[PDB]
């Protein structure tokens, strides 16, 4: 079986099986899944790896069609904590892809420019997982001509160990940088988060950073997102910076989301193929623990259980602008610095496109993520 004939046949199987899933024919879906199992492979080429995670996702969805069987398969629920591995895979994403470095650079510039002249700055991090985002902003605040303001950072995360490492690293750097700095952790999932927990004081300039968190609220195009954006609006932030996936993965039907997500993750899996060896354990961890989980959630989950409801930038702009925010175009030279970052080792093939004052991070011609800055209107 030719490798190129193997790849295209895998695509047909995915669409065919998905139709059998929608039709509900378990016999016809099982036969399609049997074929996928022998051809797909997490160690194979790009299409074999892509097929492996979409195949597992599709099989998980039809497993949910029998709730008794699905639950019984987890009756001995393996309640567990895998924090160290999850920190490790996030570090790999930060280092093997330029997405977060570009996002951090652009959002830190937008915050610094919003905090010109402010002596009291409070930054709210809705996903405080990587301390590299604020370590750079600490040095930049210290280097700014007017000297550093009093900096306060509120970190929100659902795991204490993640907040302990960030707090330790940020206090250690701020103590070296001689910056008056305060970090208060907030242990909470984002849905149960209340404004009162953020403990914002009066008279301090505020900035909100939402890295890949806004689409979470679209789960059961949403009313939960409106309430959260309005809650953020009431806090009167001087700037809100939003980093989101730039793909329509929130389509109504299974076939809709399968078609688009196949194109998006084919691009993401393509970067690793052109850069990292097939035998790399780092590559497999990222492909499984990150993209595989997102693919599985997009394909096999519904209702509130489907949190990876990615939408394009144009939808987010309307949604955020209707919530009372005005767009703050990213700095031309911040965009130039982000492009120079892409000239780094192993970042060729990426491109940054400007779209209505916002940045779109692309692989080849395929959009992947967007970065946008917003201020309160009225």
């Amino acid at each position: 079986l030719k490798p190129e004939e193997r790849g295209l046949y895998l695509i047909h199987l995915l669409l065919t099986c998905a139709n059998h899933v929608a039709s509900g024919s378990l016999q016809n879906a099982n036969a399609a899944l049997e074929q996928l199992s022998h051809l797909a492979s997490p160690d194979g080429d790009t299409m074999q790896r892509i097929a492996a995670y979409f195949t597992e996702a599709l099989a998980n969805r039809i497993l949910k069609s029998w709730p008794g069987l699905y639950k019984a398969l987890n009756a001995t629920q393996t309640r567990t904590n895998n924090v160290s591995e999850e920190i490790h895979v996030r570090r790999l994403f930060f280092e093997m892809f330029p997405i977060l470095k570009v996002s951090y650079l652009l959002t830190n510039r937008a915050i610094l420019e919003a905090m010109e002249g402010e002596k009291m700055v409070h930054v709210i991090d809705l996903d405080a997982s990587e301390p590299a985002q604020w370590l750079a902003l600490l040095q930049a605040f210290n280097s700014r001509p007017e000297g550093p303001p009093h900096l306060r950072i509120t970190g929100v995360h659902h795991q204490k160990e993640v907040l302990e490492q960030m707090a330790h690293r940020l206090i250690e750097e701020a103590e070296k940088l001689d910056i008056p700095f305060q970090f208060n952790p907030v242990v909470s999932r984002l849905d149960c988060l209340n404004v009162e927990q953020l403990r914002v004081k009066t008279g301090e300039a505020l900035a909100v950073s939402s890295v890949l968190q806004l689409h979470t609220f679209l789960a059961s195009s949403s009313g939960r997102t409106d309430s959260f954006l309005n809650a953020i609006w009431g806090l009167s932030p001087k700037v809100m910076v939003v980093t989101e996936q730039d793909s329509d993965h929130n389509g109504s039907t299974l076939m809709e989301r399968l078609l688009e997500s196949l194109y998006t993750y084919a691009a993401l899996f393509d970067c690793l193929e052109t850069k990292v060896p097939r035998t790399s354990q780092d590559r497999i961890k990222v492909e499984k623990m990150l993209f595989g989980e997102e693919i599985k959630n997009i394909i096999s989950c519904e209702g509130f259980e489907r949190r990876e409801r990615h939408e394009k930038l144009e939808k987010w702009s309307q949604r955020i602008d209707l919530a009372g925010f005005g767009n703050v175009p990213l700095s031309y030279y911040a965009m130039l610095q982000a492009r120079r970052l892409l000239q780094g080792c192993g970042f060729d093939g990426y491109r940054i496109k400007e779209e209505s004052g916002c940045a779109v991070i692309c692989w080849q011609d395929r959009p992947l993520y967007s970065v946008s800055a917003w201020r309160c209107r009225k």
């Binding site: 190129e4 790849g7 695509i11 080429d45 790009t46 084919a266 393509d270 395929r366």
Partner: peptide
Amino acid sequence: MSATALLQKAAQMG
């Protein structure tokens, strides 16, 4: 034989 091009080749004939 990129995967992003395989999807393009299959979608045309399908």
